[PDB]
């Protein structure tokens, strides 16, 4: 999902922008799923060690499955929604190996027919 960016989205440059824009999200300055310049405040605010941790935090109603967030997968850091991570995990569990499952899906787009 994506809604709006009413604040200065420029974020690639300033490392003060992390604290300032976290405050902005604390206020109503910028929504969680915002259209920042480089990153949305969701990827900044929450980072997850494993998909299990991300889905567990989802179960506590912290974040919706349609919200992009930073997740550390098998070898890489991804800005993905927990829904896409869950889809990948479903595919990887239905099959035995996970590397094959990871290489035979496209987790960057909606799963159209």
């Amino acid at each position: 999902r994506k809604e709006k960016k009413g604040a200065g989205l420029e974020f690639a440059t300033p490392e003060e922008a992390l604290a300032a824009h976290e405050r902005g999200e604390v206020a109503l300055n910028a929504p969680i799923k915002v259209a920042g310049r480089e990153t949305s405040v969701g990827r900044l605010k929450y980072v997850f060690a494993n998909p299990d941790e991300a889905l567990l935090a989802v179960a506590h109603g912290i974040v919706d499955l349609q919200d992009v967030v930073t997740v550390r997968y098998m070898g890489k850091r991804l800005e993905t929604s927990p829904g896409r991570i869950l889809f990948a995990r479903i595919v990887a569990e239905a099959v035995e190996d996970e590397k094959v499952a990871w290489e035979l899906i496209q987790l960057d787009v909606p799963q159209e027919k």
Binding site: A19, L44, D52, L55, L56, A57, H60
Partner: protein, 229 residues
């Protein structure tokens, strides 16, 4: 009697190590499979006590999104590797434990490389924490408390050093639980329920004792209706 009593739902267990546990209750009367599985799943994911790395302070760290010279992994990566460290306390009296790590020289830093403490234990000593490029000044400490469920770092704000940084806490020992209810059948009727429950746990507690804790908690919670007011 097979209609209700001899079908005292047989409770079969399949344990694959200290991580994976499948429990099958069968047979069960109609509609009770969900009625048992759902509260059990909520209890497992919500109330099981456990310990997690509440926060970390490092000597040279000022902001949570900084880069540590002499170590390729950044602060974010370091805490991210710190999240999944699991520690078991030895006696119930323990509430909080602060554990330090001093490390230098081009070597790997792992969980076993932490300085020992008598009253704590680590079930994953080979947990590769990070790497030191060349004499990396690795002077850090972690405060670890006991809790229940999952705690976002923002709200609690536990503070030890003025420059220390919060860390999100995952107290629940159970990694995840999934329960399926499948329509089994008896000799004469099909309106019966088979409850399969799969539990993945970090390793602090075996799935058997986690389930026993869950059912005990639910039973004691039920005992709250005895006294009316």
């Amino acid at each position: 009697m097979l209609d209700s009593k001899l079908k005292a739902p047989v409770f079969t267990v399949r344990t694959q190590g200290r991580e994976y546990g499948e429990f099958v209750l069968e047979p069960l009367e109609r509609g009770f499979g969900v009625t048992l599985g759902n509260p059990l799943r909520r209890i497992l994911l919500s109330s099981i006590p456990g310990t997690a790395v509440t926060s970390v302070y490092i000597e040279d760290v000022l902001h949570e999104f900084s880069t540590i010279p002499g170590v390729k992994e950044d602060v974010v990566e370091i805490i991210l590797n710190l999240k999944e460290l699991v520690v078991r306390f030895l006696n119930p009296s323990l509430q909080t434990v602060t554990l330090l790590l001093k490390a230098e020289g081009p070597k790997e830093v792992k969980a076993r490389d932490f300085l020992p403490v008598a009253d704590v234990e680590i079930m994953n000593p080979d947990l590769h924490i990070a790497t030191l490029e060349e004499g990396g000044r690795l002077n850090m400490e972690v405060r670890v408390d006991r809790g229940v469920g999952y705690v976002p770092a923002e709200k609690h704000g536990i503070k030890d050093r003025i420059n220390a940084i919060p860390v999100d806490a995952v107290f629940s020992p159970v990694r995840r639980v999934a329960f399926q209810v499948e329509d089994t059948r008896l000799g004469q009727r099909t309106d019966l329920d088979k409850l399969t429950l799969r539990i993945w746990t970090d390793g602090s507690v075996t799935p058997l004792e986690a389930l026993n804790q869950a059912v005990e908690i639910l039973r004691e919670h039920l005992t709250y209706f005895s006294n009316p007011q």
